[PDB]
Amino acid sequence: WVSGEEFYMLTRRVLQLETVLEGVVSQIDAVGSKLKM
Amino acid sequence: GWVSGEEFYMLTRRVLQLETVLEGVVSQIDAVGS
Amino acid sequence: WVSGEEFYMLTRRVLQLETVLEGVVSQIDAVGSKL
């Protein structure tokens, strides 16, 4: 009962979310360090 | 193959919640900078 | 069309984003608690 249109859409979305989250892990590691001052 | 549209619905929800939380953390981080 | 295995693979990718995310939340919440 599940089309390839929606499944593929969702996998693209998930992939974009992955790359965004790479950037964000970068920012949070940036912020955490240098949080000693 | 095994589809289970209800299952896909659950995953969609999960993705929406995850996007929401993500929005939230981008927020809290961006603010945290001094 | 259909999935089976493909759906599993996607769910594992989402599960991994969820976990990374939760790590980030722990972190930013700790820093937030350091005020």
Q: How buried is residue A2: exposed, middle or buried, by Cβ count under 10 Å (0-12/13-18/19+)?
A: buried
Nearest-Cα distance to chain A for C20, in Å, is 8
The reported resolution of this PDB entry, expressed in Å, is 2.7
Q: Tell me how the structure was determined.
A: X-ray
**Domain boundary assignment for chain C:** 1-35
Selecting from A13, A17, A31 the residue whose C-beta is nearest the C-beta of B33 gives: A31
Instruction: Return the closest-CA partner of residue C30 out of A21, B18, B26, B29.
Output: B29
* List of long-range contacts for A17-21, beta carbons under 8 Å, 24+ apart: A17/B15, A17/B18, A17/B19, A17/B22, A17/C17, A18/C13, A18/C17, A20/B22, A21/B22, A21/C17, A21/C20, A21/C21, A21/C24
Question: Of B17, C16, B3, B15, which Cα lies nearest the Cα of A9?
Answer: B15
